[PDB]
């Protein structure tokens, strides 16, 4: 029947892809990186602790000026912090207390949030009345929101738990594009440096390189043995890193189209909740469930430090645009600034 | 040191922290419960867009029970005081799955300090079925525990089966308690109006036991 021959064709194509990937691989990154000087011990100390959240912290995002940031917690508050002086610029109450993501508009006029309400809420920070108002509510997803990222003041990409991403137009509220093809729930996404591409990792242990313009899955990457919780582009937008429940990080390269390096150790057995890079893409700041955040040497995979100051699991972390400080949230309701 | 404008910014920060404290004062005055169970378990009978919150007040104490593909979201609930678990006393043999489900809850890494209230629903159906077990061969070699206090006018076989199910749950309950959380079982029928005081008292002595363990008195 058609089904059988189609199955043989599909498995033949899969094996051909695997064989091509194997052929393209000649020298590993580790072999080439045998002569570069080691990074050396990395010592980071806390500089600010931001208290005021009532419950666990779910998401965190910097501003583009490297000074303001926004955080969301279980209590239903979205708080804007002036990291330099530890001031509360804004405190926004949420209609729904189940929020799992937050974003800060690259221009700085809006913030975004969402969660188990399946709706993405956009808040205007610069009203003429002197307050903060709900600018827009985007609905249409059939599942909970996992991540959202602004492209500009008018466009925002969102990833839901129904295995589909989206690309909205905020003025109207209608999805100009839809991305489908994942098997499980999508847990994260990461816009490219130029905003022309983005990736996403799902519960099916796979990552897909999408295309915002039209919406075709350019490439698919596999190799993780469990869910992928966090994803991030390399600073040059020509690679990315994925963190999963199997206590391993993986560095994928888009051009070669296969895994390059794995960051793991036997004495590490906990999952990974968040990853981030450094301004030069030489450090990889993973966030584990054992309350710590190892600092991997991206080009050698040999650890170079730890950020051990949190009393509970680290649920999110981020690095500023200028690469001057790294913020980390956690389930004890405190954000910490490090450098 | 501060400028004329930075002082006003700090004043705004303080006036925000004031409202944050005012909200925290009420956040800690409520007890959060996680009602759980299957569609046919009888949750709707007990309650007397993926989340169904609820509010009620017992003796000037406010509760925030909210009824809720479970491996992820339930993990983010390590702050509640008690979990209300509803099971059906009738064995398709889906009951085993319930047991398995219970096991998954007990051994979860982030739920090792949350005690579980257990409701064993549908007593009338179980009694009718027994009067009119077979799927668990271990029921043959089971003797009713001496501590049992069966209700008057009850056949000893119904008591045998009922306590067999209850102890089957308590077996996985007591395996690895470690003293940080326990299980509070109850035999709730279809028409029962006292199910709220049971949750009240169980939530009270959960906290009493936590405190006692803090003082090393238990």
């Amino acid at each position, epitope marked *: 029947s058609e089904l059988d021959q189609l199955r043989q064709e599909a498995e033949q194509l899969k094996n051909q892809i695997r064989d091509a990937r194997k052929a393209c691989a000649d020298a590993t990154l580790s072999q080439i990186t045998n002569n570069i000087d080691p990074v050396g011990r990395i010592q980071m100390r806390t500089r600010r602790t931001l208290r005021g959240h009532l419950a666990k912290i779910y998401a965190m995002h910097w501003g583009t000026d490297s000074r303001l940031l926004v955080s969301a917690s279980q209590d239903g508050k979205l708080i804007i912090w002036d990291s330099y002086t530890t*001031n509360k610029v804004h405190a926004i109450p949420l209609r729904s207390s189940w929020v799992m993501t937050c974003a800060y508009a690259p221009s700085g006029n809006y913030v975004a949030c969402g969660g188990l309400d399946n709706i993405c809420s956009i808040y205007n920070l610069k009203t003429r009345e*002197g307050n903060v108002r709900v600018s827009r509510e985007l609905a249409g997803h059939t599942g909970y929101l996992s991540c959202c990222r602004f492209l500009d003041d008018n466009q925002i990409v969102t990833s839901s738990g129904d295995t589909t991403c989206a690309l909205w137009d905020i003025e109207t509220g209608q999805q100009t594009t839809t991305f489908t093809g994942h098997t499980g729930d999508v847990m994260s996404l990461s816009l490219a440096p130029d905003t022309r591409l983005f990736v996403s990792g799902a519960c099916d242990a796979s990552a897909k390189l999408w295309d915002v313009r039209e919406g075709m899955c350019r490439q698919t990457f596999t190799g993780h043995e469990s869910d992928i919780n966090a994803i991030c582009f390399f600073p040059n937008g020509n690679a990315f890193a994925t963190g999963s429940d199997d206590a391993t990080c993986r560095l994928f390269d888009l051009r070669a189209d296969q895994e390059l390096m794995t960051y793991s150790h036997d004495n590490i057995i906990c999952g990974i909740t968040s990853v981030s890079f450094s301004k030069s893409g030489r450090l990889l700041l993973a966030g584990y469930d054992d309350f710590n955040c190892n600092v991997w040497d991206a080009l050698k995979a040999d650890r170079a430090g730890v950020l051990a100051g949190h009393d509970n699991r680290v649920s999110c972390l981020g690095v500023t645009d200028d690469g001057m400080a790294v913020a980390t949230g956690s389930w004890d309701s405190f954000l910490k600034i490090w450098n | 040191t501060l*400028s004329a404008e930075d002082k006003a910014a700090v004043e705004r920060s303080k006036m925000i922290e004031k409202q944050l404290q005012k909200d925290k004062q009420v956040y800690r005055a409520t007890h959060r419960l996680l009602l759980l169970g299957a569609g046919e378990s009888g949750k709707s009978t007990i309650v007397k867009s993926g989340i169904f919150e609820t509010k009620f007040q017992v003796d000037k104490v406010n509760f925030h029970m909210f009824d809720v593909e479970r491996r992820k979201w339930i993990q983010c609930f390590n702050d509640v005081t008690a979990i209300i678990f509803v099971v059906a006393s009738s064995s398709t043999n889906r009951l085993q799955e319930a047991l398995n489900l219970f096991k998954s809850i007990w051994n979860n890494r982030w739920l090792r300090t949350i005690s579980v209230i257990l409701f064993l629903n549908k007593q009338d159906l179980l009694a009718e079925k027994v009067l009119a077990e077979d799927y668990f061969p271990e029921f043959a070699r089971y003797t009713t525990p001496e501590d049992a206090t069966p209700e008057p006018g009850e056949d000893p076989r119904v008591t045998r089966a009922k306590y067999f199910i209850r102890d089957e749950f308590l077996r996985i309950s007591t395996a690895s308690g470690d003293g940080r959380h326990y299980c509070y079982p109850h035999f709730t029928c279809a028409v029962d109006t006292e199910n709220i005081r049971r949750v009240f008292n169980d939530c009270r002595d959960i906290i009493q036991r936590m405190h006692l363990r803090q003082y090393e008195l238990l």
Partner: single-chain antibody
Amino acid sequence: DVQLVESGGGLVQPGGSRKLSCSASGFAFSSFGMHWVRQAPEKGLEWVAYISSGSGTIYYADTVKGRFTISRDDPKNTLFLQMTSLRSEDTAMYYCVRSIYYYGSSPFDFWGQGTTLTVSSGGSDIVMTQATSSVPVTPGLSVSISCRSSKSLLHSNGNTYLYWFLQRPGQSPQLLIYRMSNLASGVPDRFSGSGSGTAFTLTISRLEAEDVGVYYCMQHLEYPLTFGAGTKLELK
């Protein structure tokens, strides 16, 4: 939508007392600190009072301290000024001003209509200097106004608290530049602010006929707030 309507003016005999009220409608009143700023008839602006958000800080000018008392009523959105023992120098038009302070905000960005008060006949403060006090201009030509300060306004944190206001004939002032380089909201981008330390210059390009009025500089570095004499732009 935003309105600040002042009332309670008129004729007063010397030594009497009066009350001025400011009804605010169209914005979150409780989130804004308020100022009373007065202008004598043939003179420039002069700061008078200040009451912060929540009534937790009240400042008065040295010329009115003891006599004038400022207050606010948030529930019904009103601002009050009680004046007692009125001299003959308290003849002026009074303006109600709003101001919000947080990182990156724009203070002094809305002035009320103002109310007139007439009374029948019977130090270490920073001084702002506008040496030039008149400039004739023609449409389509670039202008340059200047202000000078007795003290360095550049604060340690990196700010420079200097403001620019434009009063047209018959209308209340209007914010143009805040902190000497940040253009306000709703102002054409031809205006630009500059300066360093103690000398500041406002440059105008593509001048039109709707830019005729008096231009004032003000300092927010430390209280009291002090205005300039007021440069005037004349039509050719």
